[PDB]
Design an enzyme around this catalytic site. Sequence first.
Site, PDB file in Angstrom:
ATOM      1  CG  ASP K  90      -2.263   0.707   0.923  1.00  0.00           C
ATOM      2  OD1 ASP K  90      -2.417   1.264  -0.183  1.00  0.00           O
ATOM      3  OD2 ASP K  90      -3.138   0.721   1.816  1.00  0.00           O
ATOM      4  CD1 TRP K 125      -1.038  31.222 -17.253  1.00  0.00           C
ATOM      5  CD2 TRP K 125      -0.588  30.010 -15.436  1.00  0.00           C
ATOM      6  NE1 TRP K 125       0.258  30.793 -17.350  1.00  0.00           N
ATOM      7  CE2 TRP K 125       0.560  30.045 -16.245  1.00  0.00           C
ATOM      8  CE3 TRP K 125      -0.544  29.302 -14.234  1.00  0.00           C
ATOM      9  CZ2 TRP K 125       1.739  29.398 -15.894  1.00  0.00           C
ATOM     10  CZ3 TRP K 125       0.628  28.663 -13.884  1.00  0.00           C
ATOM     11  CH2 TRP K 125       1.755  28.714 -14.711  1.00  0.00           C
ATOM     12  CB  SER K 153      -4.036  18.825  -3.260  1.00  0.00           C
ATOM     13  OG  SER K 153      -5.122  19.601  -2.823  1.00  0.00           O
ATOM     14  CB  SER K 154       0.606  19.320  -5.454  1.00  0.00           C
ATOM     15  OG  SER K 154       1.640  18.760  -6.236  1.00  0.00           O
ATOM     16  CD  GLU K 237       2.974  23.111 -11.324  1.00  0.00           C
ATOM     17  OE1 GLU K 237       2.600  23.422 -10.176  1.00  0.00           O
ATOM     18  OE2 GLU K 237       2.966  21.935 -11.737  1.00  0.00           O
ATOM     19  CE1 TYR K 239      11.911  20.707 -18.386  1.00  0.00           C
ATOM     20  CE2 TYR K 239      12.007  22.736 -17.153  1.00  0.00           C
ATOM     21  CZ  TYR K 239      12.289  22.024 -18.278  1.00  0.00           C
ATOM     22  OH  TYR K 239      12.957  22.642 -19.302  1.00  0.00           O
ATOM     23  CB  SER K 250      10.596   5.190 -20.405  1.00  0.00           C
ATOM     24  OG  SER K 250      11.298   6.401 -20.588  1.00  0.00           O
ATOM     25  CG  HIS K 284      13.178  30.963 -18.839  1.00  0.00           C
ATOM     26  ND1 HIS K 284      13.458  30.321 -17.655  1.00  0.00           N
ATOM     27  CD2 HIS K 284      12.044  30.400 -19.305  1.00  0.00           C
ATOM     28  CE1 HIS K 284      12.550  29.390 -17.434  1.00  0.00           C
ATOM     29  NE2 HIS K 284      11.687  29.411 -18.428  1.00  0.00           N
ATOM     30  CG  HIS K 285       8.905  32.398 -17.572  1.00  0.00           C
ATOM     31  ND1 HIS K 285       8.050  31.849 -18.501  1.00  0.00           N
ATOM     32  CD2 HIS K 285       9.514  31.356 -16.963  1.00  0.00           C
ATOM     33  CE1 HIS K 285       8.136  30.534 -18.454  1.00  0.00           C
ATOM     34  NE2 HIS K 285       9.012  30.210 -17.523  1.00  0.00           N
ATOM     35  CB  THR K 310      15.444  17.258 -23.471  1.00  0.00           C
ATOM     36  OG1 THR K 310      15.246  17.948 -22.233  1.00  0.00           O
ATOM     37  CG2 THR K 310      14.090  16.868 -24.017  1.00  0.00           C
ATOM     38  CE  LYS K 313      13.629  11.332 -20.226  1.00  0.00           C
ATOM     39  NZ  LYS K 313      14.014  10.085 -19.531  1.00  0.00           N
ATOM     40  NE  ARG K 432       0.609  34.422 -23.866  1.00  0.00           N
ATOM     41  CZ  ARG K 432       1.208  33.864 -22.825  1.00  0.00           C
ATOM     42  NH1 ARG K 432       2.519  33.708 -22.787  1.00  0.00           N
ATOM     43  NH2 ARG K 432       0.475  33.452 -21.797  1.00  0.00           N
TER      44      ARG K 432
HETATM   45  C1  HEA Z   1      -2.425  21.654 -20.142  1.00  0.00           C
HETATM   46  C2  HEA Z   1      -2.099  22.581 -21.010  1.00  0.00           C
HETATM   47  C3  HEA Z   1      -2.957  22.972 -22.154  1.00  0.00           C
HETATM   48  C4  HEA Z   1      -3.694  22.142 -23.111  1.00  0.00           C
HETATM   49  C5  HEA Z   1      -3.815  20.644 -23.202  1.00  0.00           C
HETATM   50  C6  HEA Z   1      -4.300  23.202 -23.970  1.00  0.00           C
HETATM   51  C7  HEA Z   1      -5.174  22.858 -25.103  1.00  0.00           C
HETATM   52  C8  HEA Z   1      -5.731  23.761 -26.125  1.00  0.00           C
HETATM   53  N1  HEA Z   1      -5.589  25.108 -26.051  1.00  0.00           N
HETATM   54 FE1  HEA Z   1      -4.631  26.275 -24.577  1.00  0.00          FE
HETATM   55  N2  HEA Z   1      -3.695  27.376 -23.029  1.00  0.00           N
HETATM   56  C9  HEA Z   1      -2.943  26.912 -22.014  1.00  0.00           C
HETATM   57  C10 HEA Z   1      -2.631  25.491 -21.836  1.00  0.00           C
HETATM   58  C11 HEA Z   1      -3.203  24.360 -22.572  1.00  0.00           C
HETATM   59  N3  HEA Z   1      -4.002  24.491 -23.647  1.00  0.00           N
HETATM   60  C12 HEA Z   1      -2.425  27.919 -21.061  1.00  0.00           C
HETATM   61  C13 HEA Z   1      -1.556  27.688 -19.857  1.00  0.00           C
HETATM   62  C14 HEA Z   1      -2.958  29.180 -21.593  1.00  0.00           C
HETATM   63  C15 HEA Z   1      -2.756  30.584 -21.070  1.00  0.00           C
HETATM   64  C16 HEA Z   1      -3.883  31.088 -20.194  1.00  0.00           C
HETATM   65  C17 HEA Z   1      -3.507  32.470 -19.717  1.00  0.00           C
HETATM   66  O1  HEA Z   1      -2.922  33.227 -20.513  1.00  0.00           O
HETATM   67  O2  HEA Z   1      -3.783  32.815 -18.552  1.00  0.00           O
HETATM   68  C18 HEA Z   1      -3.710  28.707 -22.786  1.00  0.00           C
HETATM   69  C19 HEA Z   1      -4.440  29.615 -23.665  1.00  0.00           C
HETATM   70  C20 HEA Z   1      -4.852  29.230 -25.014  1.00  0.00           C
HETATM   71  C21 HEA Z   1      -4.807  30.160 -26.166  1.00  0.00           C
HETATM   72  C22 HEA Z   1      -4.297  31.567 -26.206  1.00  0.00           C
HETATM   73  C23 HEA Z   1      -5.495  32.472 -26.009  1.00  0.00           C
HETATM   74  C24 HEA Z   1      -5.017  33.856 -25.681  1.00  0.00           C
HETATM   75  O3  HEA Z   1      -3.827  34.145 -25.903  1.00  0.00           O
HETATM   76  O4  HEA Z   1      -5.841  34.659 -25.205  1.00  0.00           O
HETATM   77  C25 HEA Z   1      -5.364  29.380 -27.275  1.00  0.00           C
HETATM   78  C26 HEA Z   1      -5.488  29.896 -28.660  1.00  0.00           C
HETATM   79  O5  HEA Z   1      -5.537  29.148 -29.616  1.00  0.00           O
HETATM   80  C27 HEA Z   1      -5.696  28.033 -26.746  1.00  0.00           C
HETATM   81  C28 HEA Z   1      -6.324  26.951 -27.502  1.00  0.00           C
HETATM   82  C29 HEA Z   1      -6.220  25.534 -27.160  1.00  0.00           C
HETATM   83  C30 HEA Z   1      -6.809  24.496 -28.025  1.00  0.00           C
HETATM   84  C31 HEA Z   1      -7.567  24.695 -29.306  1.00  0.00           C
HETATM   85  C32 HEA Z   1      -6.474  23.253 -27.316  1.00  0.00           C
HETATM   86  C33 HEA Z   1      -6.832  21.877 -27.752  1.00  0.00           C
HETATM   87  O6  HEA Z   1      -5.766  20.949 -27.534  1.00  0.00           O
HETATM   88  C34 HEA Z   1      -8.118  21.423 -27.066  1.00  0.00           C
HETATM   89  C35 HEA Z   1      -7.907  20.423 -25.934  1.00  0.00           C
HETATM   90  C36 HEA Z   1      -8.005  19.006 -26.455  1.00  0.00           C
HETATM   91  C37 HEA Z   1      -7.598  17.964 -25.715  1.00  0.00           C
HETATM   92  C38 HEA Z   1      -7.704  16.575 -26.267  1.00  0.00           C
HETATM   93  C39 HEA Z   1      -7.038  18.178 -24.329  1.00  0.00           C
HETATM   94  C40 HEA Z   1      -7.985  17.633 -23.269  1.00  0.00           C
HETATM   95  C41 HEA Z   1      -7.407  16.365 -22.691  1.00  0.00           C
HETATM   96  C42 HEA Z   1      -8.168  15.370 -22.214  1.00  0.00           C
HETATM   97  C43 HEA Z   1      -9.664  15.465 -22.216  1.00  0.00           C
HETATM   98  C44 HEA Z   1      -7.483  14.140 -21.664  1.00  0.00           C
HETATM   99  C45 HEA Z   1      -8.079  13.732 -20.326  1.00  0.00           C
HETATM  100  C46 HEA Z   1      -8.158  12.224 -20.313  1.00  0.00           C
HETATM  101  C47 HEA Z   1      -7.946  11.499 -19.211  1.00  0.00           C
HETATM  102  C48 HEA Z   1      -7.611  12.151 -17.905  1.00  0.00           C
HETATM  103  C49 HEA Z   1      -8.046  10.011 -19.294  1.00  0.00           C
HETATM  104  N4  HEA Z   1      -5.464  27.924 -25.303  1.00  0.00           N
HETATM  105  C1  HEA Z   2       5.241  20.916 -20.733  1.00  0.00           C
HETATM  106  C2  HEA Z   2       5.730  22.002 -20.168  1.00  0.00           C
HETATM  107  C3  HEA Z   2       6.913  22.713 -20.717  1.00  0.00           C
HETATM  108  C4  HEA Z   2       8.205  22.152 -21.116  1.00  0.00           C
HETATM  109  C5  HEA Z   2       8.741  20.744 -21.098  1.00  0.00           C
HETATM  110  C6  HEA Z   2       8.903  23.373 -21.569  1.00  0.00           C
HETATM  111  C7  HEA Z   2      10.276  23.270 -22.064  1.00  0.00           C
HETATM  112  C8  HEA Z   2      11.185  24.353 -22.452  1.00  0.00           C
HETATM  113  N1  HEA Z   2      10.793  25.644 -22.503  1.00  0.00           N
HETATM  114 FE1  HEA Z   2       8.892  26.456 -22.044  1.00  0.00          FE
HETATM  115  N2  HEA Z   2       7.000  27.213 -21.482  1.00  0.00           N
HETATM  116  C9  HEA Z   2       5.939  26.554 -20.966  1.00  0.00           C
HETATM  117  C10 HEA Z   2       5.933  25.106 -20.722  1.00  0.00           C
HETATM  118  C11 HEA Z   2       7.032  24.163 -20.983  1.00  0.00           C
HETATM  119  N3  HEA Z   2       8.227  24.536 -21.491  1.00  0.00           N
HETATM  120  C12 HEA Z   2       4.749  27.381 -20.648  1.00  0.00           C
HETATM  121  C13 HEA Z   2       3.428  26.930 -20.089  1.00  0.00           C
HETATM  122  C14 HEA Z   2       5.177  28.725 -21.049  1.00  0.00           C
HETATM  123  C15 HEA Z   2       4.439  30.039 -21.010  1.00  0.00           C
HETATM  124  C16 HEA Z   2       4.138  30.493 -19.598  1.00  0.00           C
HETATM  125  C17 HEA Z   2       3.188  31.654 -19.697  1.00  0.00           C
HETATM  126  O1  HEA Z   2       3.650  32.805 -19.789  1.00  0.00           O
HETATM  127  O2  HEA Z   2       1.968  31.412 -19.681  1.00  0.00           O
HETATM  128  C18 HEA Z   2       6.554  28.481 -21.531  1.00  0.00           C
HETATM  129  C19 HEA Z   2       7.386  29.571 -22.033  1.00  0.00           C
HETATM  130  C20 HEA Z   2       8.829  29.468 -22.225  1.00  0.00           C
HETATM  131  C21 HEA Z   2       9.737  30.638 -22.124  1.00  0.00           C
HETATM  132  C22 HEA Z   2       9.383  32.054 -21.759  1.00  0.00           C
HETATM  133  C23 HEA Z   2       8.951  32.784 -23.020  1.00  0.00           C
HETATM  134  C24 HEA Z   2       8.000  33.899 -22.681  1.00  0.00           C
HETATM  135  O3  HEA Z   2       6.961  33.628 -22.051  1.00  0.00           O
HETATM  136  O4  HEA Z   2       8.282  35.051 -23.056  1.00  0.00           O
HETATM  137  C25 HEA Z   2      11.059  30.081 -22.459  1.00  0.00           C
HETATM  138  C26 HEA Z   2      12.322  30.865 -22.480  1.00  0.00           C
HETATM  139  O5  HEA Z   2      13.400  30.355 -22.257  1.00  0.00           O
HETATM  140  C27 HEA Z   2      10.887  28.629 -22.714  1.00  0.00           C
HETATM  141  C28 HEA Z   2      11.960  27.722 -23.113  1.00  0.00           C
HETATM  142  C29 HEA Z   2      11.920  26.275 -22.896  1.00  0.00           C
HETATM  143  C30 HEA Z   2      13.096  25.406 -23.135  1.00  0.00           C
HETATM  144  C31 HEA Z   2      14.486  25.763 -23.573  1.00  0.00           C
HETATM  145  C32 HEA Z   2      12.591  24.073 -22.828  1.00  0.00           C
HETATM  146  C33 HEA Z   2      13.349  22.806 -22.892  1.00  0.00           C
HETATM  147  O6  HEA Z   2      13.119  21.991 -21.742  1.00  0.00           O
HETATM  148  C34 HEA Z   2      12.992  22.027 -24.151  1.00  0.00           C
HETATM  149  C35 HEA Z   2      14.104  21.021 -24.402  1.00  0.00           C
HETATM  150  C36 HEA Z   2      13.846  20.115 -25.580  1.00  0.00           C
HETATM  151  C37 HEA Z   2      14.498  20.291 -26.740  1.00  0.00           C
HETATM  152  C38 HEA Z   2      15.473  21.416 -26.909  1.00  0.00           C
HETATM  153  C39 HEA Z   2      14.238  19.374 -27.908  1.00  0.00           C
HETATM  154  C40 HEA Z   2      14.964  18.052 -27.709  1.00  0.00           C
HETATM  155  C41 HEA Z   2      16.450  18.176 -27.950  1.00  0.00           C
HETATM  156  C42 HEA Z   2      17.077  17.557 -28.959  1.00  0.00           C
HETATM  157  C43 HEA Z   2      16.318  16.685 -29.913  1.00  0.00           C
HETATM  158  C44 HEA Z   2      18.570  17.726 -29.126  1.00  0.00           C
HETATM  159  C45 HEA Z   2      18.887  18.837 -30.120  1.00  0.00           C
HETATM  160  C46 HEA Z   2      18.881  20.186 -29.437  1.00  0.00           C
HETATM  161  C47 HEA Z   2      19.860  21.077 -29.647  1.00  0.00           C
HETATM  162  C48 HEA Z   2      20.997  20.765 -30.570  1.00  0.00           C
HETATM  163  C49 HEA Z   2      19.825  22.404 -28.956  1.00  0.00           C
HETATM  164  N4  HEA Z   2       9.473  28.230 -22.697  1.00  0.00           N
HETATM  165 CU   LIG Z   3       9.777  28.383 -18.460  1.00  0.00          CU
END
Ligand code: HEA
Ligand code: HEA
Ligand SMILES: [Cu+2]
Lengths: 153, 91, 76, 90, 104, 266, 141, 47, 86, 114, 504, 72
Positions: K90, K125, K153-154, K237, K239, K250, K284-285, K310, K313, K432
């Site tokens: 458990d 958000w 909760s988390s 958050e 990651y 995997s 970076h934000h 990444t 991986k 946006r």
């Molecule tokens: C979890 C992250 C997530 C996911 C999945 C999505 C999904 C989608 N989102 Fe976005 N979106 C955000 C995270 C996400 N979004 C965030 C963080 C913002 C910013 C809000 C802010 O600015 O404050 C945003 C805002 C945002 C914008 C920008 C609006 C703006 O700038 O004002 C747009 C525009 O196209 C958009 C469209 C969509 C569409 C068409 C999908 C489509 O993919 C529709 C979804 C379809 C799905 C299939 C996903 C649902 C999944 C399930 C139902 C699986 C559940 C099942 C089990 C649990 C078994 N959403």
């Molecule tokens: C699923 C969640 C998720 C993940 C995994 C990531 C992954 C990464 N993100 Fe992002 N990010 C968001 C969720 C995520 N992000 C959200 C929600 C926002 C907007 C928040 C908001 O304002 O609402 C955001 C916005 C955001 C910003 C801020 C931009 C802005 O708002 O003005 C930046 C800047 O550095 C960034 C960079 C990256 C980088 C470098 C990675 C890296 O981890 C990605 C690494 C992966 C690769 C690079 C590809 C794999 C690599 C290879 C195949 C090898 C080859 C590569 C090289 C040779 C370089 N993302």
């Molecule tokens: Cu970030």
Amino acid sequence: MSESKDQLKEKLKADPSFRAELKDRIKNALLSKVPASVPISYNFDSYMLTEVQPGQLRVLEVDERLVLPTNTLIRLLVTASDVLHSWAVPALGVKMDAVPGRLNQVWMSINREGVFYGQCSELCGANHSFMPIVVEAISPRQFLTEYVKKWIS
Amino acid sequence: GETIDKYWAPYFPKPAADEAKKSVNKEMVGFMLLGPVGVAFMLYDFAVGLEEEHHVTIPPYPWMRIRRLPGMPWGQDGLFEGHPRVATTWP
Amino acid sequence: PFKLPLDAYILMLPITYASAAFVAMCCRVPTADPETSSIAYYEDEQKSAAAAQRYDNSFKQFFDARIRNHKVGVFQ
Amino acid sequence: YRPLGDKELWHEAWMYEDKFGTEEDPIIVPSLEAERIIGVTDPEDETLVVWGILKDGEPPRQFVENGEFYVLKHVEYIKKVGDVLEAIEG
Amino acid sequence: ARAQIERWAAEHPTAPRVGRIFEVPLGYVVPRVAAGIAAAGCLWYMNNTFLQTYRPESLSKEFLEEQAKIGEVAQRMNAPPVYLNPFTNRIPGSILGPEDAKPE
Amino acid sequence: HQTAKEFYMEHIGKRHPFHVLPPSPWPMLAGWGTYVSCLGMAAWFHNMPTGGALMAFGMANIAWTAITWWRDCAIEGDMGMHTEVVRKNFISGMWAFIVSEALLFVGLLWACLHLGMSPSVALQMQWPPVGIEPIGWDKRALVMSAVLAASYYSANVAMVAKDPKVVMGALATTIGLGAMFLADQYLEYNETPFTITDSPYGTTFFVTTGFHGMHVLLGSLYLTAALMMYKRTHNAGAALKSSILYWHFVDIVWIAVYGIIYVGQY
Amino acid sequence: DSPQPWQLLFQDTATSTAQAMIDLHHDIFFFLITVVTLVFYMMFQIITKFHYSKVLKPEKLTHHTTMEVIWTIIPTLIVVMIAIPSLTLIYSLDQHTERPGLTVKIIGRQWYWSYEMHDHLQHKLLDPDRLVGIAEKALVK
Amino acid sequence: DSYKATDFTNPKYNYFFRELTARVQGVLLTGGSLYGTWLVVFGEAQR
Amino acid sequence: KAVYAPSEYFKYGEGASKHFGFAKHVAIAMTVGLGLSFAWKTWHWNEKRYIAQYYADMARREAREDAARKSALADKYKQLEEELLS
Amino acid sequence: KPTLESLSADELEELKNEVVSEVVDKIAGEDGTKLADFLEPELITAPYDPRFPNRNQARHCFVRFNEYYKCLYERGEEHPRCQFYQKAYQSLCPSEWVESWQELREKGLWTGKY
Amino acid sequence: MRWLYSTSHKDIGLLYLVFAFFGGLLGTSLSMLIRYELALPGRGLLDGNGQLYNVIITGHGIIMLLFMVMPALFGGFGNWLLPIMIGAPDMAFPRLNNISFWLNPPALALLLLSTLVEQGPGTGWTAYPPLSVQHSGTSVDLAILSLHLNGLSSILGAVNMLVTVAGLRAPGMKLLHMPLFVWAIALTAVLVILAVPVLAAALVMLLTDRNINTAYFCESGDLILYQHLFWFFGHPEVYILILPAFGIVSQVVSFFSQKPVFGLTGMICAMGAISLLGFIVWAHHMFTVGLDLDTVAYFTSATMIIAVPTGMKIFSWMATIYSGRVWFTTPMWFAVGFICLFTLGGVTGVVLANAGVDMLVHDTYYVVAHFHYVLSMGAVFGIFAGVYFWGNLITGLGYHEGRAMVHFWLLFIGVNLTFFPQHFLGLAGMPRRMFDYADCFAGWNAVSSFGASISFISVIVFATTFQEAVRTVPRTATTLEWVLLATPAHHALSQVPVLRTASS
Amino acid sequence: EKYSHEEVVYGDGHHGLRKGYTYDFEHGPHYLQPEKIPNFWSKFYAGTGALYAVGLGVPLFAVWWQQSKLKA
Ligand code: HEA
Ligand code: HEA
Ligand SMILES: [Cu+2]
Ligand SMILES: [Mg+2]
């Protein structure tokens, strides 16, 4: 009397040092004919145009633009009064957030004339979509000889 | 008499009487290093409490008595505040 | 726990570089210009300007000779 | 039995047996039920795990290739080795 | 590694093993995704047609033709007009605007 | 019931040393108590009538649910359901909770370090702001540091002692020393010549010292609850050790609080 | 200047700074194209060549130290090759090595921008020494 | 022979603590939750 | 007769990777990626050539107005020269 | 008649001033409304202070605003460095900040010494 | 009574899965209003209300971030699969596991109630002050209290997970024999415990600024301090929401290739390097808020390092598929799609890391296209890969393979046509969080709103995939949940399994 | 009895079908037996439909509620 005036002219003819000194006196007297420094100041607001006409761009157009000369180092101090904003003009590569209390500076040098459009890039409320930015870029001689005279009281 | 604790007890032995007293006195040295003096000064402090007064009025600076929302959720003055300092009727 | 493989130390070189840079950036902030709790810091103009130009030039002076040559891209 | 130093006293050895189970001499797994899940690693790789199920009254069974053979035996008590037989220290 | 594969293939008998990369035949998949795309297109069309409360006057055909007469030209309140975006529309550097050109 | 213990011994207790719980009603009641108290708190912020009473009602329900949950845990300890490995897991969970509370205080003191180090033009770039008379380190705060260090050492006595009278007396001394830290923080909160509404200095001072005082009160109540389980059976187990660990965490937090706010004037 | 319909990339520029930013973006995209091509082509070939109709039974391949070191060390060189121009671009944003010609105080309100300026205009005689010599030869005769 | 009237974990107190409270609290949470939802959604903030 | 575990893997090299040619496919992928990347960079270089030619022609224009400005200033100087000599 | 061999220094200086002025009033004008073709305009803004190297320039504004009133207290009202301080803070400080600071000074809520 | 008083981990995990499905439905409903307002220039169905559009995007972002992906991967698959995978009978604290779940419906209820109070919480958000402080009413307080309850909760869930992995493993099984999903969940728990209380402190400061007239983020405070604290929380958050997807991918890729995972220790080290680097790159934000150039310089240089683990991986997953015997099923297509399409989400993150380029594309739709590549196509594909993989074990119901392939192709087409045109909008400068845009941005907006309807249709088609199951008997496997019967008993692992190390 | 500490600790020793279950979830071989609820596929589709209805209609009610307050 008058021959002494003519004798002073003859000493101008004769002595190079007296000639250069009276040339410097002429230069000093001509600088007293130059107008004094005057302040250039304005304080105006820029609002989006509700209804546009052909040749204008919807959403992006303002009523009062910002006039900036080209080829000139300009200091832009960005701030805000109530909430956060952001001054973004993608043509000039400038995007700096307007924070109440801060004074963020940008150094900018415009290469060519033109008209450059931009919008706010920080969420600030109901009308975040309706705060556009237009920059009018003219030559420095036009700015220094024509535009600044509009703000002289 | 047949609890889970007693059932698993022989498989979890305790890690091995006067050594406890030695450790107790070792920690009690550090206890009386600061124990009686802190309690004595705090008992002195409890009798020299709300008797002294300050009459230092403070002018209403922009960082003093912020009132973004009017009043407080419990009343006008702040909590735990019986003697307000910032001045009213700022000459 | 397990034996770290040969990749993870090639990982740990820029990770150690980033951690050291983070510690240095945290450390050098309370030894900078605007971190002074007084208006009387700026009435000494020589020391204030010298300290602020020292804070300017550090980590920038490694880039001035390529700022002047427009080395701002991978290619030209 | 393998050296019981750095072994928890309740891990129920037979897992810590000094034998390689063969076809003609399998390792006898004790169980409280008619079936039990056990886990055997690859003899050539410690990182790989194969989980299998042994059943009561069956022939010897090998889980990984070139691995030990096993036979389940239903018992009412499993010797919790660490205070059951090293306290005996026979 | 093979036995869990054969067990999962028995608990999921509708998943075929016929010797091709896309095991489910495309004659089953293509019509149903086409029907889903068609339903999505109908929803998009319904939103475009019946769910607008203000259509902008800058998209009417009179505005569009009067704009296409002018071109990518911006007026200035302190200068002659200028061609917008000169690099993508390939205006040469000698020409700054329409009125300053004065064609030969 | 009489075969419930038999079934437990046949299927769970004699097979692994971990503890399997019967179904329980307290998590759901605690969650919906949080819902009610959050509604009451939001109504009390904006002076809605009968909002503070609703917030107090939700908090009283959460407190009752937690008290009955902890009484159930104490009952389960007294019937020998916990082996040694279960108690080790209890201390591990307390360590994880301590790490989370530590990062909460790190985020709280980040604000003190940021706001104190670089004053802004709105403050006319003077730290501390004019009018504010800061609280000195050469006074009652030093007495508090001495008392809380004495509480640290007396709680350290009860961890290692084997005589039950020594353990009970040391725990009572630790609890009474913790109560004098809070009764004197109340005197600081009454004599201080500023408010939480007076400048970021007053804001950070009151919020950080209030969070620390709340943690002191929680640790004192946890040490009190661990003592009564020892006053009955002369055994506490993980209740004594985890309460001592939490108290030492509170003591370590006070070092950073004192050395950033009281000494560094931040 | 202004955006266009069906546009893919950035707008046109009026400063050297923004053109430097766009050139840095295209330099990064140079590497990204090769990365995505390698990943997509290798995924396609691995998918097609190792289907179970081709493979009687798989091979045991858990580690390969050379390839692991290679795909660890090649992207780090790409990161450091990208970083130095980006670091140079960040530090070149301050351009106070000239005489500033204008101050503009931009204030953001709800929901209009507000613009301010307070400078001083002064005039200077353009090349006065020619006029000085003209006055010299006007006074000598 | 190991429980007294002062003892908090007395088994004679098990009904009051684990059964009566699980229904009194279970209805008080509902009666407070509905009032709180009405107070928040349909209430006017005075501050 | 006991229950034997079956042979589950080949050794890496004598199964269906002997005919894959890993290095050949990596070379092909890198060749295709480098060709596309060089096409993109060739386009970018061409655009930068156009921008440089634009600014050169703009400077060629801009030199012409300010030469005729100083020539007009010299004409005014030649007028004021005889204004104080007549 | 006093010739150049018999004139003193002050009379010669006055004669030089008369000789220069009588012709430059013909050249440039008595006021100077004739030099508009030979005049070059130039706009004066606040210079870069090395004391303030960061992007936030509110401290530069505040320091210049305080230095103006320090100059006004110390070196009179019309000293050129005081107008340098005035035209440097007016070139940087937003007018709302300035009017807030003067109303704070008028209320008695300014923490400066002078 | 079973589903209200549960102490079993398999019931609480299934409750998390259902609650996550409900949150996904709510967010998908909120996401159609966004794409239907944004289909055409002018004023759409929202009647020119900007406050309501801001409320809608705020609620949509918070719901899809916190109440969909987090309870599905961490609370859903983690609670169900962790003790079976390590061999624990458990969880360590079974009643704490129930209050971990039962603080989520009060949080979701408070968040949904905030939309109906006053004019709602239109803040985004991220909830930046002074926009959060200026809002009169009660709605912003309810939204932030929802955030507090979700964070607590988390934290409690991570506490239970960390004590379970550390102290209830099977005998003979060290931290080398656990599968990669367990490692992913453990590192996720570590990140949660370290990062969430920073958010709790920031939101406490926000509450005191709003309601107590304090001076944390105000006239006399510092508004950059909130962004510092919030993004120090918020970049770990993202990651937290992506590491269990790596673990699931995997497990899935290893299963159907008939091969173990390539480079196991390299996989664990890459996950650990990603976990460690996520705490030092957060600003970076904040490239455009006015930070000093050395801070910008460091955060540009440090953010690009996350690409290397990444990439290892991804190449390790491709080497796992390499030289195997691969059978392409529906969960297999959701993992190959993950590998091929998370790469497109990471390469634009590299571009966003470089602060010079980020001066042009900050708060544009380039950012949105990036983070909908890494979330709608990395995390959602990971969630759906495990539903068709472990679904007959968890729920007892089989699925039709043809309708699942229809659902996969519909989702794949609908997300590559929604957010791929949002790159071109952001490069051309469309901002946006706006509902009325310029006339020239109409074509890609129309294409994106066409893609969103295909996404909604694929959401509808998913409900029709379930069917009755066929139950068989297990003999051998490589992970411990594929020797159990489907469904397993209420007390699965009646005898605690042990791992015997052979003579080798 | 019925309120002893043994009831708190080990639960209540019930055997067999609880109240209205058709299968023993606690002590049977499966904790979830979906082929043994009577009318399972009807209640399953009813619950799925209700879940889709609520999850797709709660935002529309929130849009209607705020826009009906301005239109007053
Ligand atoms: C979890 C992250 C997530 C996911 C999945 C999505 C999904 C989608 N989102 Fe976005 N979106 C955000 C995270 C996400 N979004 C965030 C963080 C913002 C910013 C809000 C802010 O600015 O404050 C945003 C805002 C945002 C914008 C920008 C609006 C703006 O700038 O004002 C747009 C525009 O196209 C958009 C469209 C969509 C569409 C068409 C999908 C489509 O993919 C529709 C979804 C379809 C799905 C299939 C996903 C649902 C999944 C399930 C139902 C699986 C559940 C099942 C089990 C649990 C078994 N959403
Ligand atoms: C699923 C969640 C998720 C993940 C995994 C990531 C992954 C990464 N993100 Fe992002 N990010 C968001 C969720 C995520 N992000 C959200 C929600 C926002 C907007 C928040 C908001 O304002 O609402 C955001 C916005 C955001 C910003 C801020 C931009 C802005 O708002 O003005 C930046 C800047 O550095 C960034 C960079 C990256 C980088 C470098 C990675 C890296 O981890 C990605 C690494 C992966 C690769 C690079 C590809 C794999 C690599 C290879 C195949 C090898 C080859 C590569 C090289 C040779 C370089 N993302
Ligand atoms: Cu970030
Ligand atoms: Mg932004």
